[PDB]
Design a protein around this ligand. Structure first.
Ligand SMILES: [Ca+2]
Ligand SMILES: [Ca+2]
Ligand SMILES: [Ca+2]
Ligand SMILES: [Ca+2]
Ligand SMILES: [Ca+2]
Ligand SMILES: [Ca+2]
Lengths: 523, 523
């Protein structure tokens, strides 16, 4: 009844109970939990509960732009777009006009690679820290170009460059937007960076863009030929970066400064998008929220949900856990003690968690006062960076098992597992996961949980590949998370062997395989 | 109960008790110091207690731009942005369009290098003056560039310049803000000066910037590529500076004028930044305040905090000492007798304090009337220039010990120290601090306090480097601040030794190692 801000949601409703139905506001009482309505909590001191240019009434009543993702309807979640550029095919011709020697390679853009390339894992995890620390944290703007169609052949051989000259470079690209907001007068600047050697800056203008870029699409819309770099001329190169690129290094591509407007609905008619900008509010959004990246094996999200300053009782903003933030940011189906995506079982024991040094130190500090020792029951403070990686394959010996192949001696008939049941061991356990399904010249992590209600009954693992290893593991009365690395190579090799030899007492649960980054092939 | 300004805070509350909670003002009764609420004090003759475009109500209540630092929520702390230019990579090419003979070198920018370059250090500090006098005081507008990748090789050999001609010069720059205020319509002028020969006046324009620069942010936001000078043409140089830059002089780069606006909350919607300027309150803030620079090893701050004219009985403005200004300007945690930043124990005996002639002589004058002989218990004066430099390493035989190398014959089981405990001396005292963790070819100072409850018992010290030195130090009943200079060299040398022989009576405390400025090299 009592109103604070210029939003129709009152002080008693801005916090502690939050529902909008048929363009009026009602409290939350768990009577319409599965009837398409969710509970929120907003700041009661700002109608713009997030850093958004929207009142929390404007953003949660449907009274806003329909191109905005409904994940931004939560008042704590801010509408925030991120545009990057995917790399498709690299063509190298020795002319400045556009004949001559020319090579062409198929390039794949990896977005979340540099964030996760400098990650090195131990065999075991100390304390309740069930995650690892990245060396550096990078957002979803940068892209790393991997050459796939690269047999043993030097790049110099296809161009025949002797002493000082070089060719010219041309590229195939995609212009993706990954955020909870739409984007209109897109003007991105972009650096073509080879380990700091920026070959050129290309700005995408507006003509080769079109005056709309909705979230979740490239400029070449889905299945289409990628846009070449001639529509605004050729990029030069010199013979220092050729053997640099040839041997181990890859070309990188980074969007530097992306400029444009947003749209606001007018009084009478259709939208107007002229007198706005996603430049005057970027820092306002980026300062109040933490930064959370979700990364499946085929797409990614990145969200900014407003958090709390702990050293500020004057700051009266809602406080949520990690899991509450993930549910109200990305959208999650709440099963009993579990969060789900549309299909992926997401948990602190089902995916891979990555934090930079500040976030890792903060959660290491916070885990100690927890009486439960879990990652997700930690309140969010303003301004941390969190990354979530879905593993490539995952089973929990439960409803979810998307494996390429099954094991040997699977005794899942159990109930003292982490999620219900668990897989018993009696003898060996075998998987022969093929060469062609896996991506060449990459790095992969096999992780699992082993529990043993015995004193010193132990297991041995063996990962047989081109870089094979044999390791010894001791489980105990508690559950043990273990991780072991291996490297992929090109597809003309044999299959991939993983063998586990136990002693019939150790129990295995929640086995996952994830990708980390690509090892550079020698060329 | 009496209102004087247009500030809702009354006459009885604009002085002697000052708290904003939930956009109302209450007196200070120290029932609420430890819940994140700081005590302040404002004018009652002017609405804007500082020279900022904010009243004391506007700036201390959250009723202002959220991009402004909360250290500027203190009404005595003025919103004052200082934008400097980081220098990253120096590339020399002999062409005009952008082939030819090129070199590329790694350069590092120091903000406070010229301010602390004229610092001459006494081994024995007279009076309570436990500090030094710099010859010159410079703000955070200038930068000095040191070239790192320097083997023995002249610049002229790599370009082969005989008589009159020369190449052109190209640069990598970043554009940081160091102040308690934001920045929008960035129009800076920056001179590229080589010992008086300004090689260019580079203007950043606005397109290569974007219309925002937050406090504490470069133009390439954190991890990116630095902005280059081809997006606005090449810069020339001539063959009088080629040997000059080669032999002794390094290029400096300083901002002269920066133009641009700030942002105000409108009546209806969002912030507006057209009808503002960071060129009119610059003189209002720079002239009413002292100029206080803080220099960590990894960033720098520069604040202008309003001071008092002591020759003015009608002027009723708040008055603070050095420490009160530091706390209210930077944000500090108060331990028992200690000011803390995030981790650094800051004091008048834990860091280096630097004053130009005006501030240093006024401090020496103020030292006589004080009965405590400490530096921080001096009232601030208008238009004073105070610089604080942290030591690179600092230990006090206490909770704070960040020395990577460790000492010998350390008996910290004592309590007659300056800060609690002290280290007893028996025989030799050794430290082998290696070449890897010290910055090559730069001037460093080993400083400490020696106290001796005996008549003439003394020590000998020895700082062994490429120049080794032995000194004789006599301590007495009081605490003695002593300092010894030394120079680092290239990493192909041996370790750095600091040794001292005592006589079993001398006591040592508060040992620090700081750095003053870089030295030119033979080339
Ligand atoms: Ca309200
Ligand atoms: Ca609100
Ligand atoms: Ca299970
Ligand atoms: Ca007033
Ligand atoms: Ca006032
Ligand atoms: Ca001490």
């Amino acid at each position: 009844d009592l109103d604070t801000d210029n939003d129709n949601i009152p002080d008693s409703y801005e916090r502690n109970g939050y529902t909008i139905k048929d363009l009026i506001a009602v409290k939350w009482e768990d009577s319409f939990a599965e009837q398409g309505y969710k509970k929120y909590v907003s700041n009661y001191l700002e109608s713009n509960t997030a850093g958004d240019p929207y009142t929390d009434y404007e953003k949660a009543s449907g009274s806003f732009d329909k191109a905005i993702k409904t994940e931004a309807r939560d008042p704590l979640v801010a509408a925030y777009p991120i545009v990057g550029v995917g790399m498709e095919k690299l063509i190298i011709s020795t002319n400045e006009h556009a004949q001559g020697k020319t090579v062409s390679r198929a390039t794949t853009n990896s977005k979340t690679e540099s964030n996760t390339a400098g990650v090195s894992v131990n065999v075991g995890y100390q304390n309740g820290f069930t995650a690892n620390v990245t060396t550096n944290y990078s957002h979803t703007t940068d892209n790393s170009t991997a050459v796939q169609d690269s047999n043993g052949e030097s790049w110099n051989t296809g161009l025949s460059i002797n002493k000082g000259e070089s060719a010219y470079i041309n590229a195939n690209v995609r212009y993706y937007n990954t955020g909870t907001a739409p984007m209109y007068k897109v003007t991105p600047t972009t650096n073509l960076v080879l380990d700091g050697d920026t070959l050129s800056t290309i700005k995408a203008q507006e003509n080769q863009i079109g005056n709309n870029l909705s979230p979740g699409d490239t400029y070449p819309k889905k299945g289409l030929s990628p846009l070449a770099l001639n529509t605004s001329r050729l990029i030069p190169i010199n013979y220092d970066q050729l053997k640099k690129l040839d041997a181990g290094k890859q070309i990188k591509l980074e969007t530097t400064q992306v400029s444009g407007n947003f749209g606001t609905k007018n009084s009478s008619g259709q939208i107007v998008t002229e007198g706005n900008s996603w430049s005057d509010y970027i820092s306002q959004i980026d300062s109040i929220s933490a930064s959370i990246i979700l990364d499946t094996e085929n797409e990614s999200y990145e969200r900014r949900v407003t958090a709390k300053n702990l050293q500020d009782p004057e700051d009266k903003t809602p406080e949520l856990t990690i899991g509450e933030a993930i549910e109200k940011a990305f959208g999650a189906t709440k099963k009993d003690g579990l969060l789900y995506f549309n299909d992926i079982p997401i948990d602190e024991s089902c995916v891979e968690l990555i934090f930079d040094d500040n976030t890792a130190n903060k959660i290491k500090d916070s885990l100690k006062t927890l009486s439960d020792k879990k990652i997700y029951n930690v309140k969010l403070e303003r301004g941390m960076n969190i990354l979530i990686k879905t593993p490539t394959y995952f089973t929990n010996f439960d409803d979810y098992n998307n494996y390429p192949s099954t094991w040997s001696n699977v005794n899942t008939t159990n109930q003292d597992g982490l999620q219900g049941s668990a897989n018993k061991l009696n003898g060996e356990t075998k998987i022969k996961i093929p060469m062609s399904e896996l991506k060449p010249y990459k790095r992969y992590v096999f992780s699992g949980y082993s529990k043993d209600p015995l004193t010193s009954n132990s297991i041995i693992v063996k990962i047989k590949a081109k870089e094979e290893k044999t390791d010894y593991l001791v489980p105990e009365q508690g559950y043990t998370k273990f991780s072991y690395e291996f490297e992929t190579t090109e597809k003309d090799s044999s299959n991939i062997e993983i063998t586990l030899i136990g002693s019939g007492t150790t129990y295995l649960d929640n086995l996952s395989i994830t990708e980390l980054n690509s090892t550079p092939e020698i060329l």
